[PDB]
Amino acid sequence: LPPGWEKAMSRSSGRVYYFNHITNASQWERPSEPARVRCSHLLVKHSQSRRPSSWRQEKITRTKEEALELINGYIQKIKSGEEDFESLASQFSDCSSAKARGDLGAFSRGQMQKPFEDASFALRTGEMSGPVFTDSGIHIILRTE
Ligand SMILES: O=C(CCCO)NCc1ccc(F)cc1
What we know:
By secondary structure, the chain is of the alpha+beta class. It has two domains: 1-31, Ubiquitin Ligase Nedd4, Chain: W; 36-145, Chitinase A, domain 3, CATH 3.10.50. Helix content is 23%, strand content 26%. The chain is built from three helices and seven strands; from the N terminus they run E-E-E-E-H-H-E-H-E-E. It has helices at residues 64-80, 85-92, 114-122; strands at 5-9, 16-20, 26-27, 36-44, 103-108, 132-134, 137-143. Strands 5-4-7-6 form a four-stranded antiparallel beta sheet, sandwiched between helices. Strands 1-2-3 form a three-stranded antiparallel beta sheet, with no helix packed on it. Strand 2 and strand 3 (26-27) form a beta hairpin. It starts with a strand and ends with a strand. N-[(4-fluorophenyl)methyl]-4-oxidanyl-butanamide binds next to strand 5. It is classed as isomerase. The entry lists the keywords cis-trans isomerase, isomerase.
């Protein structure tokens, strides 16, 4: 029963699943620290972001609820294989790292905003987060190293 993870029950199907309250990931199978990790991310900003502006939009006006809907939609397409994380990050991430397919490079604890850092270090290599909230907006995080 690894830390961060809990058992839960599907409302629609009644089948057990597992949920991580640090990364907001959820999955059906029973789940399986380094100085540094490397992550990519897809950021969707909203009107309450620290700076409501990006390379995509001079004035970001979408609500925090609308931003969460967009994040949820991207997660669905990534999990179905219909779209690649890197493709969606390049097209739709409100972070300048979109130009690098979302790649932020490597970082230690104490550099990123805390909810982002905690989710990044709690992911296993290759694992992707659910929606992660920071003062910048809502993130999907992919731990690559
Ligand atoms: O430089 C890299 C990747 C480095 C090698 O892995 N990405 C560009 C970038 C990173 C963080 C940003 F906040 C904005 C842009």
